[PDB]
Design a protein around this ligand. Structure first.
Ligand code: PCW
Ligand code: PCW
Ligand code: PCW
Ligand code: PCW
Ligand code: ATP
Ligand code: ATP
Ligand code: A1BYZ
Ligand code: A1BYZ
Ligand code: A1BYZ
Ligand code: CFF
Ligand code: CA
Ligand code: ZN
Ligand code: ZN
Lengths: 48, 505, 146, 48
């Protein structure tokens, strides 16, 4: 229910929510969430 | 329909993504349903009688469209066989006379009859195409436009790219009273208004789509059945000029229609000069399947072949520059010592000479220029000739031949890949045969009785034909997903056997 | 057996039995399977070559008739393109076998008002008939091997 | 050989995750599992 109510916020921040997986200190795979900057994404998408 | 299915399977397996596979499959199902309706319409059983006869005649042409094409090919071959007997003379059978030289005396009337028949058959082929294939072209164009309107806001939220000629041309049909003429959905305009109306403006959307908001409520309010007679005046009043212009643009941009039109033009020209009928011999490429496949080997790497020819031109130009600056004395092509004929006393002539003679010579330009033995530049000349032979004659031509051979190999690889994919994996769920074959003939049973794509097409037809108030729960679920264009109901990576592995064991 | 009986009539009919090597030797049978695997495509390619040469013959018969004189004697010319049948035979028999195409065997176009037309004619004949179609045949054989 | 190299690169990218190396077959047990994994879980762009 909370996710459905936050649909608009999640949609708005979708391009800026970076998600990766690492092998952490626990010896388990962990998901990491971070912020991707607009400038960083634009530069990444530059054709060169 | 079987040929269409094979073509679709080939296209999906080769140039297709797993993400859009089901979207393309549903699109193929829609096109096949429309084609089935066309086939049913053309299947064999003053204004009224004329209409009856006209419809029967057009149905006959549509039914025998391919037979007419083969007949045109045969007529072209017969005409050219006759042409083989032509002869030229300075006196009637300084201007020259062309006439057939045959003993019977019947070929010339036969030539006239065959030429007239060929032109007639070409015209009939155009009509048959316009009645049999154009409807699907318009159906596909309208379907794509409607989807791009409703689900992408192509002309509401976005715009064409100023080079998408199709997008720019489709702007002409948006406000026409009869936009969805072949596409089944006759309420796309209402759906678009309801979807984008609030954010873009209901009046603005109505202006864009040529809708009358006020009267469109009245239509729902009550039932109005008009009484249009067969009057030509009424037919004129019914004509929608803007939609017709858009349709004619689409048709005259369609490739096959243009091919048939140029065929007809070429036949008409053949009536002006019989030798223009030779152009229709090229029809074999489009007609015969084996020849089309063979020619695909050349056309597959056509861009590379053209680039290779350009590179050859550049290399020959460099050799021409060297020859023009250093080896001009060797390019005399006249035996008469009084009047020499120097082929490299100007760059244009030298370049033409090189490109025309050296490239065609077996041993290169050294075969056709003067012998260098005994000259102070003998070693320079032999290096020149040997390098020309090895770079232009041995390597570049080898590049062309290798391009053709690689095209053959790649096309065979594509066919084999499609065959292997179909025989080793389910087209719907994607699970491999290895899993299913744990049961005897498990893969065959699965692909014939469980995940048959023909059965999915039949289910779509069945859902369309069945009343909605009679739908079962599962039928209603799938119908709603179809209307929303959600393809989640298709099993992907899962199956009944996988779901109930232990229970079924 | 029939061919052997004929060989008794004329001994040279016994030469036909040399073709038996294809059926007999296994290596030769495998080698010949490379040619026969795409035999339909090879025949279709030869037909396409015939059609293309016919188109070139039509163009030559209508425009380049003056260049097809094969007689040195100025008294008695021997025109090879004064009728379509002769021109087609000439093209298919000489131009296809020529290393550089029909331009090797027809008269030099230099100095003529149609010089550029003639060089385009010869170059396109060389590239389409000699370079590409024969390359198609060789590629068919190579693909059969593979 | 050059065509083979190009095809091999394409097939490897389309049948295996560039980061973890697990094949598509495993991920596709879930609908569009490989696409979801390579776009939202192990995206090399996300690692950058
Ligand atoms: C587009 C590339 C070429 C296409 C082939 C033919 C051109 C067709 C198209 C377009 C432009 C034509 C516009 C002008 C129309 C007038 C035609 C013309 O100007 O008529 C000149 C000569 C025919 O002489 P005439 O008028 O005195 O006839 C006797 C008639 N009376 C006695 C009344 C004078 O025209 C002739 O030579 C006709 C016979 C020889 C021409 C070659 C045609 C058939 C040969 C091979 C197949 C076609 C080539 C394949 C190329 C494919 C690669 C694209
Ligand atoms: C990629 C495929 C395209 C390449 C095409 C060529 C490949 C095969 C070629 C050639 C071998 C022959 C080399 C050229 C002949 C040189 C003769 C020589 O050396 O006599 C010394 C000359 C004579 O003096 P001059 O004043 O009377 O003539 C110059 C004044 N004019 C031009 C106004 C008359 O003096 C000089 O020019 C000094 C030298 C000038 C500078 C060197 C440029 C020479 C041209 C090409 C060299 C590259 C080819 C060799 C590489 C082969 C592997 C592909
Ligand atoms: C079916 C395609 C051709 C098959 C090859 C041979 C034809 C066999 C088949 C069938 C039709 C024959 C029906 C007529 C039978 C009579 C034979 C004949 O009419 O006899 C004419 C000449 C031999 O002269 P003579 O009668 O005066 O002998 C002296 C005898 N006295 C002195 C009594 C006159 O016949 C000669 O020239 C015999 C020697 C030269 C002919 C070539 C044979 C061997 C050469 C190469 C291998 C075979 C060709 C391979 C083709 C494969 C692709 C299908
Ligand atoms: C696919 C492989 C097969 C293709 C075979 C050909 C490929 C290479 C070919 C040819 C280049 C030469 C073009 C033909 C020479 C035209 C000369 C010209 O233009 O002189 C203007 C003429 C002279 O007027 P006239 O009344 O004295 O002669 C006509 C009256 N008669 C025929 C009764 C004598 O007037 C006219 O005919 C106006 C022009 C007539 C309509 C154009 C048809 C010309 C024939 C072929 C054009 C297509 C080849 C070019 C494409 C190359 C890429 C493959
Ligand atoms: N979901 C699927 N539905 C149907 N066939 C599938 C499916 N997945 C894989 N296949 C394979 O696709 C091939 C379909 O066979 P095919 O198209 O030859 O049958 P058909 O109905 O006789 O038609 P046609 O003779 O016109 O080819 C078979 O190898 C079948 O195993
Ligand atoms: N770890 C991964 N990260 C990203 N893509 C991966 C990964 N593993 C496999 N792939 C595959 O690599 C391909 C990447 O697609 P692609 O490079 O075309 O995307 P893009 O961002 O649109 O860029 P471009 O259009 O420039 O190629 C996809 O097939 C994706 O499935
Ligand atoms: C009569 C037999 C045909 C094949 C139509 C023909 O003549 O074709 C060539 C050869 C030459 C003899 C004369 C030609 C005259 C004009 C056009 C350019 C035409 C090609 C048709 C184009 C290109 C196609 O690829 C598809 C398409 O849309 O129309 C062309
Ligand atoms: C010294 C012995 C030779 C044989 C000349 C040598 O070494 O190479 C030859 C043959 C081959 C192996 C490679 C060569 C390529 C380019 C150079 C320029 C050279 C030509 C020498 C020029 C030609 C005339 O001007 C006379 C002269 O002396 O200079 C040639
Ligand atoms: C204008 C400069 C040239 C060089 C003529 C040009 O542009 O193309 C050439 C060379 C190559 C690039 C492509 C060509 C193919 C076909 C055309 C018809 C053309 C021949 C021009 C005809 C031949 C004579 O009738 C004389 C004349 O003027 O017209 C030719
Ligand atoms: C999805 N869909 C169709 O695909 C369809 C149809 N009528 C014809 N087709 C082809 N209807 C009503 C439909 O809803
Ligand atoms: Ca009910
Ligand atoms: Zn399945
Ligand atoms: Zn991964």
């Amino acid at each position: 229910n909370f996710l459905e109510l936050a649909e608009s916020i999640l949609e708005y921040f979708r391009p800026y929510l970076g998600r990766i997986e690492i092998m952490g200190a626990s010896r388990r795979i962990e998901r990491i969430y971070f912020e991707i900057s607009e400038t960083n994404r634009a530069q990444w998408e530059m054709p060169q | 329909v079987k040929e269409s299915k094979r073509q679709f399977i080939f296209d999906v397996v080769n140039e297709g993504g797993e993400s859009e596979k089901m979207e393309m499959f549903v699109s193929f199902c829609e096109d096949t349903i429309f084609e089935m309706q066309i086939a049913a319409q053309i299947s064999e059983p003053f204004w009224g009688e004329l209409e009856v006869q006209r419809v029967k005649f057009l149905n006959y042409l549509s039914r025998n469209f391919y037979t007419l094409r083969f007949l045109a090919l045969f007529l072209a071959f017969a005409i050219n066989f006759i042409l083989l007997f032509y002869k030229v003379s300075d006196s009637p059978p300084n201007m020259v006379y062309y006439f057939l030289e045959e003993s019977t005396g019947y070929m010339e009337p036969a030539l006239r009859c065959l030429s007239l028949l060929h032109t007639l058959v070409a015209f009939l082929c155009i009509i048959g195409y316009n009645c049999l294939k154009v409807p699907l072209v318009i159906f596909k164009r309208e379907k794509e436009l409607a989807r791009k309107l409703e689900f992408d806001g192509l002309y509401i939220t976005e715009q064409p790219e100023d080079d998408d000629v199709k997008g720019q041309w489709d702007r002409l049909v948006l406000n026409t009273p009869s936009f969805p003429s072949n596409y089944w959905d006759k309420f796309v305009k209402r759906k678009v208004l309801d979807k984008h109306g609030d954010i873009f403006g209901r009046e603005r959307i109505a202006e864009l789509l040529g809708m009358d908001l006020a009267s469109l409520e009245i239509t729902a309010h009550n039932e109005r059945k008009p009484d249009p007679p067969p009057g030509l005046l009424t037919w004129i009043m019914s004509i929608d000029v803007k939609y017709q212009i858009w349709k004619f643009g689409v048709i005259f941009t369609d490739n096959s229609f243009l091919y048939l039109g140029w065929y007809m033009v070429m036949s008409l020209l053949g009536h002006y000069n019989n030798f223009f009928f030779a152009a229709h011999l090229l029809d074999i490429a489009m007609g015969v399947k084996t020849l089309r496949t063979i020619l695909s080997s050349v056309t597959h790497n056509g861009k590379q072949l053209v680039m290779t020819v350009g590179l050859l031109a550049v290399v020959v130009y460099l050799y021409t520059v060297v020859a023009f600056n250093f080896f001009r004395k060797f390019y005399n092509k006249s035996e008469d010592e009084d009047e020499p004929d120097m082929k490299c006393d100007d760059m244009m002539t030298c370049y033409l000479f090189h490109m025309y003679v050296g490239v065609r010579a077996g041993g290169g330009i050294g075969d056709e220029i003067e012998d260098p033995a005994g000259d102070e530049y003998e070693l320079y000349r032999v290096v020149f000739d040997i390098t020309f032979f090895f770079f232009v004659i041995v390597i570049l031509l080898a590049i062309i031949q290798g391009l053709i051979i690689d095209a053959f190999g790649e096309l065979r690889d594509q066919q084999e890949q499609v065959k292997e994919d179909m025989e080793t994996k389910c087209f719907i769920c994607g699970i491999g045969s290895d899993y299913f074959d744990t049961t005897p003939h498990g893969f065959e049973t699965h692909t014939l009785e469980e995940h048959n794509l023909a059965n999915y097409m039949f289910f779509l037809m069945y859902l369309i034909n069945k009343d909605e108030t009679e739908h079962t729960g599962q039928e209603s679920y799938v119908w709603k997903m179809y209307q929303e264009r959600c393809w989640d109901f298709f099993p992907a990576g899962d199956c009944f056997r996988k779901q109930y592995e232990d229970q079924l064991s």
